[PDB]
Paper text:
Bacterial cells use several evolutionarily-distinct genome segregation systems, the most common of which is the type I Par system. It consists of an adapter protein, ParB, that binds to the DNA cargo via interaction with the parS DNA sequence; and an ATPase, ParA, that binds nonspecific DNA and mediates cargo transport. Each chromosome encodes its own segregation complex, with Chr1 encoding a chromosomal type Ib system, and Chr2 encoding a plasmid-like type Ia system. In this study, we have reported the structure of the ParA2vc protein, in three states: apo, nucleotide-bound (ADP) and in a filamentous complex with nucleotide and DNA.
The purified protein crystallized readily, and the obtained crystals diffracted to ~2.5 Å. The obtained ParA2vc crystal structure includes one ParA2vc molecule per asymmetric unit. The overall structure of the ParA2vc monomer is similar to that of P7 ParA, with an overall RMSD of 2.2 Å for CA atoms. No ligand density was observed in the active site, confirming that this structure corresponds to the apo state of the protein. It is worth noting that the nucleotide-binding site is generally poorly resolved, and in particular we were not able to build the P-loop in this structure. One of the symmetry-related pairs is consistent with a biological dimer, and largely resembles the P7 ParA dimer structure. This suggests that we have obtained the structure of the ParA2vc dimer through crystallographic symmetry. Overall, this structure confirms the common architecture of ParA proteins, and is consistent with the fact that the V. cholerae chromosome 2 is plasmid-like, as suggested previously, since the ParA2vc structure confirms that it belongs to the type Ia family.
Numbering used by the authors:
A (entry chain A), B (entry chain A): 4 to 119, 124 to 182, 188 to 368, 376 to 406
C-alpha cells in the first residue's frame, strides 16, 4: 500500500497544516518575568571594578539629577542592573566596545555545543553580561529546537504589542530583512541591559527536512551559508560577542552554525558517556568543516570545559585528570561542581545569578572564574581573528 | 586560516581517535540488576487469565516436579516472572505465537517517535511483555543515541563473558552477520523472559555524519534500507512485535527506522509545544516517506497517544479535547496522567511495573488500558499487514 499511505500522509499534511500555533500567545503564556537580585554596593563594587568612592560619587551625581534609589529594610543601597549600568556611564567608564583600541573589532562567534541541562552557555552569557566595567554587548542564540533557552532569560516580551517572533531558522528560511528589522522583531531584550536573546521553536525542525532534501537537488554546500548570510552578518554591527547554542546532533542546523562560527566551545562532564560521544565527535569532526565553501574562515580557538564536577569521588577525578593530562591546556581549570544550586536552576529555569551560603558563591565563583578564564582566551585571539 | 584549522582538526581526529571507550565496562558499571516484584496469585490471576483452580493445578504440577516456590512472611505465594511463564506452559496454554492461526504472521514493526521522559515505548514493551496469557516475543530497540533506554531494563549482562555489545547502527555500518550472530551478541535478555533489548550508544551519532556525506556521492536513497536489510529482517524470525524508538529529530537514523517500519506511534502531551512540533512534523511528514525506494511497504496504521495528563486543569482539557474533537479516533482514550509515580520512574530509571496506593494502580491501570487499547488495533491490522 505504498501509495495509499502517502496519500493519507499528505491528507494529514494539508489537513493539519492549517490548525493552530499562536506563538506570541505561548511566549506570553510563559512570562516568568521576574527580575534580578539587586546588588549591595559591595557586590556592585565587585562586579564593577569601582572604588566605593568613585561609585558613591557616581550615585551622588545620579541623585543630584532626578534619580531615586530604592532602599533596604536596613536603609542600605539596593542597586538594580539598570542602575548599575547607568552608574557606570555616570562614573565615566566606557563600554568594552567603547575603548576604541577595540572598536573596529569583529565579533566573537562562539558556537557552544552541548553534548547531552543544556544550560552552560546561558551561565556564560550572564557572567559575561554581568561584568559592568566592560559591559559587553552579547547575544545568546538558541538553535536547538528542543531548547528551553528562552524560559531561562525570558525576553522582555514588551507586550502582545509584538508583531511576530522569529527564530534563527525563521530568518534562514524566512518569515525585507535588515538590521533595523532584526532589532525590532527577532532579537529581544532580557533583564541584562546588554544581553539580547534569539529563541528557537521546535518548528525550527523543518530546517533539517529541507536540508536533507535540498541536497537531492544538489551535492552543493550552499546550505551552510544561510545563517551567516541571512542573519549573523546582519547583526554583527550591534554585538561584541555572539553565542550559538546547538546541543547534540549532527545537523545542517549545527552545520549552519559552524560555518558562520569562528570559535568552538564544547561543554562536557567527567562522565565517560559524554566524554565518549565527544571523541567520536572530534573523529567525525574534521570533514565536518572541510565541507563548507572554502571561504570558511577557519576556527580561531576551540576548547572544552568540565561541567558538573564531583571533587569528592575519587572516581570522577579518575576521568578529569585523564582529561587534564590527556589535554592539559585547551581544557579549563574551572571545574564547575555538581551543586544543589546549579540543579535547582535547571528545576526553576533560572541561572545561579537569579537567586538569593552553600552553593551560592561557589556556584557563581565557579562560573565567574570559568568566565574570567574563558575571558582571557577571547582577548588572546581577538587580534588574529580581527584580521 | 581555513586550511590550518582543518589540519588541527584531523590532528585531533586521529590524535584522539585512539584514546578509549570500554563499552562492556560501562554497561557493567551500570548494572542496576535488580528484578521484578513477585506476583500475588491474585495478580498472577489478573495478568494470566487463569482461574485460581487452573493456576493452582499448574503450581501443583510444578511442585510435584522438583520446583520450590518462594514464600511470604505470611506464607503466601510469591511468584516470579519466570515462575509465571513456566506456570503458563504448565497450564498448557500456548504463547501468542503458538496459536498457529497466527504463526505464519509477520512481525509488527512499530516505530515510536518521542517528540520531546522518552519512556513510553518502554512502558508499552513492559505491559505487552507482562501479559502472560499471550506472552509476546517483543523487542525494544533504542535508536536515539541520547537514550537511557537500557538503563531502564538493564539487559542481563550475563557477564564480562560477553565479547562485545553492538547497537542498531553498529549493525547498519557494522562491527559475518546472521540471526545466530545477532542473538548471541546484540540482543540481550531483560528481566521479562520474553522482552529482549537492543541498546544505542551516543557513538551511534556517526551514522548521520556518514549519511549526510554519503549523499554527496549520491542523491541515491539506499541509505534508508540499511537497518531493515542489515538487522530487522535478520531478526524478524524470533519476534512477534518490534518497537523502534527514535525521539525527536529529522534523521537518516529515524529515516532508516521509518523505511523498515510498518506502523507509527507518536507519543505527545496536552502541551501546545509538543503538539505544535508534531503538526509541523506531519506537515513535513509525507515527502518524508515518499523518498525511500518505492519498495516501501507503506504504513498500516499510525496513531498518537496522550502522555502526562492533568485531568484537573481545565486548561489541559482545553487542548486534549481540541485533540479529541480534532482527531477523534486515531488518538487514544487512555490519557496517562502526570503521576508522582511515573515521574519517579524517570528519576530512578524504572517503569511503574518495577516498584511496590496513590499512583500504583492508576499508573499501571493507565498504561495497562493504554496497552489493551493499543492491543486491539494491532490485531485489527495484523491481517492486512500480513499480506
Amino acid at each position: 500500500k505504498r501509495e495509499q499511505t502517502i496519500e493519507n500522509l499528505y491528507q494529514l499534511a494539508q489537513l493539519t497544516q492549517q490548525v493552530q500555533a499562536d506563538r506570541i500567545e505561548i511566549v506570553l503564556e510563559e512570562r516568568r518575568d521576574e527580575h534580578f537580585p539587586p546588588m549591595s554596593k559591595a557586590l556592585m563594587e565587585t562586579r564593577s571594578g569601582l572604588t566605593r568612592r568613585k561609585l558613591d560619587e557616581a550615585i551622588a551625581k545620579m541623585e543630584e539629577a532626578g534619580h531615586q534609589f530604592t532602599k533596604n529594610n536596613a536603609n542600605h543601597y539596593s542597586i538594580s542592573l539598570s542602575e548599575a549600568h547607568m552608574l557606570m556611564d555616570a562614573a565615566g567608564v566606557p563600554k568594552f566596545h567603547e575603548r576604541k583600541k577595540n572598536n573596529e573589532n569583529k565579533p566573537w562567534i562562539i558556537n557552544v555545543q552541548n553534548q547531552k541541562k543544556s544550560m552552560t552557555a546561558v551561565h556564560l552569557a550572564a557572567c559575561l553580561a554581568l561584568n559592568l566595567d566592560k559591559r559587553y554587548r552579547i547575544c545568546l542564540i538558541d538553535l536547538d529546537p528542543q531548547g528551553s533557552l528562552r524560559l531561562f532569560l525570558n525576553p522582555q516580551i514588551s507586550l502582545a504589542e509584538h508583531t511576530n517572533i522569529y527564530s534563527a531558522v525563521d530568518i534562514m528560511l524566512d518569515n525585507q530583512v535588515d538590521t533595523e528589522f532584526l532589532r525590532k522583531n527577532v532579537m529581544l531584550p532580557t533583564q541584562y541591559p546588554n544581553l539580547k536573546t534569539i529563541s528557537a521553536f521546535p518548528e525550527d525542525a523543518m530546517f533539517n527536512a529541507e536540508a536533507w532534501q535540498y541536497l537531492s537537488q544538489n551535492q552543493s554546500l550552499d546550505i551552510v551559508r544561510l545563517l551567516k548570510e541571512k542573519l549573523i552578518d546582519k547583526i554583527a554591527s550591534d554585538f561584541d560577542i555572539i553565542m550559538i547554542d546547538t546541543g547534540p546532533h549532527v545537523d545542517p542546523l549545527v552545520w549552519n552554525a559552524m560555518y558562520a562560527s569562528n570559535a568552538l566551545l564544547i561543554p562536557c562532564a567527567a562522565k565517560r558517556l559524554d566524554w565518549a560521544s565527544t571523541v567520536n565527535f572530534f573523529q567525525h569532526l574534521p570533514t565536518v568543516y572541510e565541507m563548507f565553501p572554502e571561504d570558511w574562515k577557519g576556527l580561531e580557538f576551540v576548547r572544552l570545559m568540565p561541567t558538573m564536577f564531583e571533587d569528592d569521588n575519587k572516581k570522577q577525578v579518575s576521568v578529569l585528570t585523564e582529561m587534564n593530562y590527556l589535554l592539559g591546556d585547551q581544557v579549563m581549570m574551572a571545574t564547575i561542581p555538581r551543586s544543589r544550586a546549579f540543579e535547582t536552576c535547571a528545576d526553576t529555569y533560572s541561572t545561579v545569578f537569579d537567586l538569593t551560603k552553600k552553593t551560592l558563591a561557589t556556584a557563581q565563583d565557579a562560573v565567574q572564574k570559568s568566565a574570567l578564564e574563558l575571558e582571557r582566551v577571547l582577548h588572546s585571539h581577538w587580534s588574529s581573528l580581527n584580521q
